[PDB]
């Protein structure tokens, strides 16, 4: 799918060695038109038992259960989307659901309740955009963690990388061919990758883009499915 494009885009920028030029003009590479629509604002790793719960920046919630199924609660607080292993989607609500989804919906509720009361919203300083709140939300396609980061791949092709130690974050989009970098002060800049090639960037962002490439490679080498 789009991961192949993302890998192209990252290799291209990394190959240009953006931090090794005479004058870095990183600001020239910012493009506000590329600001992402969605990113993960909160997450809870309960995967030893149930799965990975997350909140998107639009206050919608989702769970990727250990059996590779998914529940998405829209930000209206009732509308539900269930995704089976093969990707089959069905629509329903918390108030009206098959009894068969009782347990999973209860789990969703607990995740929702927890991320409603606890934790800071990543990207809180970026504008809530007026849009169709029921327009199809992306869901968490897959995820994994390393010692250094959690890697989140969304069904809209975006890859998010949150670094544990310094709390910096990347939001990569292969459609916009852009990266959003959230730094240690929670400053939020969105860059077109091709312009990072043109103008370069600081060594800190350059290092993270190198890591990002490695992570996308992992996603590609383990995409599996049936």
């Amino acid at each position: 799918c789009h991961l192949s494009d993302m890998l192209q885009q990252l290799h291209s920028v990394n190959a240009s060695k953006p931090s090794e030029r005479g004058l870095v003009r990183q600001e020239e590479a910012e493009d506000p038109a590329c600001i992402p629509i969605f990113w993960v604002s909160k997450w809870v790793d309960y995967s030893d038992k149930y799965g990975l719960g997350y909140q998107l920046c639009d206050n919608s919630v989702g769970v990727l259960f250990n059996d590779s199924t998914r529940l998405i609660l829209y930000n209206d607080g009732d509308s539900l989307q269930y995704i089976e292993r093969d990707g089959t989607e069905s629509y329903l609500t918390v108030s009206s659901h098959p009894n068969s989804l009782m347990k999973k919906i209860t789990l969703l509720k607990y995740f929702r309740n927890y991320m409603s009361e606890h934790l800071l919203k990543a990207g809180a300083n970026i504008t809530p955009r007026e849009g169709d709140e029921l327009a199809r939300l992306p869901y968490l396609r897959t995820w994994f963690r390393t010692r250094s980061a959690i890697i989140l791949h969304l069904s809209n092709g975006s890859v998010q990388i949150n670094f544990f130690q310094d709390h910096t974050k990347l939001i990569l989009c292969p459609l916009m061919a852009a990266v959003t970098y959230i730094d240690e002060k929670r400053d939020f800049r969105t860059y077109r990758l091709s312009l990072l090639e043109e103008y370069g960037c600081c060594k800190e962002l350059a290092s993270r883009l190198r890591y990002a490439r490695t992570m996308v490679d992992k996603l590609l080498s383990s995409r599996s499915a049936s």
Partner: peptide
């Protein structure tokens, strides 16, 4: 085990 969870975000910030």
């Amino acid at each position: 085990l969870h975000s910030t």
